[PDB]
UniProtKB/Swiss-Prot annotation, chain A:
Disulfide bonds join 60-154. GO terms for cellular component: extracellular region. Belongs to the calycin superfamily. Lipocalin family. Synthesized exclusively in the proximal part (caput epididymidis) of the epididymis. It makes up a substantial part of the total protein in the epididymal luminal fluid and binds to the sperm membrane. It comes from Rattus norvegicus (Rat). Keywords: Disulfide bond, Secreted, Signal, Transport. It is found in: Secreted. Associates with spermatozoa in the epididymal fluid but does not bind tightly to them. Binds both all-trans and 9-cis retinoic acid. May act as a retinoid carrier protein which is required for epididymal function and/or sperm maturation. This is Epididymal-specific lipocalin-5. The gene is Lcn5. Pfam families: Lipocalin. The keyword Disulfide bond applies. GO terms for molecular function: small molecule binding.
Length: 164, 160
């Protein structure tokens, strides 16, 4: 795990996807016109159910997926018809944000994407500076980072689909 | 900023972010395109050429500024509506944060901008940008970080 005292209990509920880095591729992021993404993390007994929303162009897609633990505290695996994605929590304060490392094996590719999730839409200054230092350390350039626009069209469909 | 000398700020600057209400838305529308500035001294006034994307195209503006009481405050008098630009913070080497209040015929606009000497490694200047725009009353929702589309930048690099 890269955080070693991780408990998913401290991470359930709603998150906004504030930024991502991709290369490379374209545009992626987303486409146109960018729309913010978000995630609902759900504990469904030995499975993590994640529901994400992003703009796949003419629509807000809601994508629900299951993750299992992947051998290390904060290491999870998600298998999709493409291939495996391996997601790692890289840093968190356990209270406002979580920085995630994603290796994803689609059609014979291996790209890594990193993402900054936050509990809130304001006062992410400290989280984003952290995320710019860690993406850097992982080989990403300032051109690789995409800070999402505060257009919440998809977000609100995810909040609402989760409320009732 | 207190002791300011414009010889330090001559030249090409890239606009990394701006703040406005604001627107419508922003910037841008888508795709945004980056903005840029060229600062020249032309017969005792400040000659400023800026470019940015305004719905569908790169705009090239060319303005002239006068010093406006105290070291880092400049006034742009356009057809009697003003722009007041202040340098809020700078490290005198890689970035300058500018506060701009414009009266564009009736309307008041308060924009703040982050200009950089470089396109890379602006992490610290952006975090300072976030702290200085929240202090000035802007939300995180009000900050726009420019996409690295360099079409308007290259336009201004050529000539103007």
């Amino acid at each position: 795990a890269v955080v070693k005292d991780f408990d998913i209990s401290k991470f359930l509920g709603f998150w906004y996807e504030i930024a991502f880095a991709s290369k490379m591729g374209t545009p992626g992021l987303a486409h146109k016109e960018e729309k913010m993404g978000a995630m609902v993390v759900e504990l469904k007994e030995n499975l993590l159910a994640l529901t994400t929303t992003y703009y796949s162009e003419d629509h807000c897609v809601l994508e629900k997926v299951t993750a299992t633990e992947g051998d290390g505290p904060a290491k999870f695996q998600v298998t999709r018809l493409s291939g495996k994605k391996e997601v790692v929590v890289e840093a968190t304060d356990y209270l406002t944000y979580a920085i995630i490392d994603i290796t994803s094996l689609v059609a014979g590719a291996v790209h890594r994407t990193m993402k900054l999730y936050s509990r809130s839409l304001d006062d992410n200054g400290e989280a984003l500076y952290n995320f710019r230092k860690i993406t850097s350390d992982h080989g990403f350039s300032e051109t690789d980072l995409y800070i999402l626009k505060h257009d919440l069209t998809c977000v609100k469909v995810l909040q609402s689909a989760a409320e009732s």
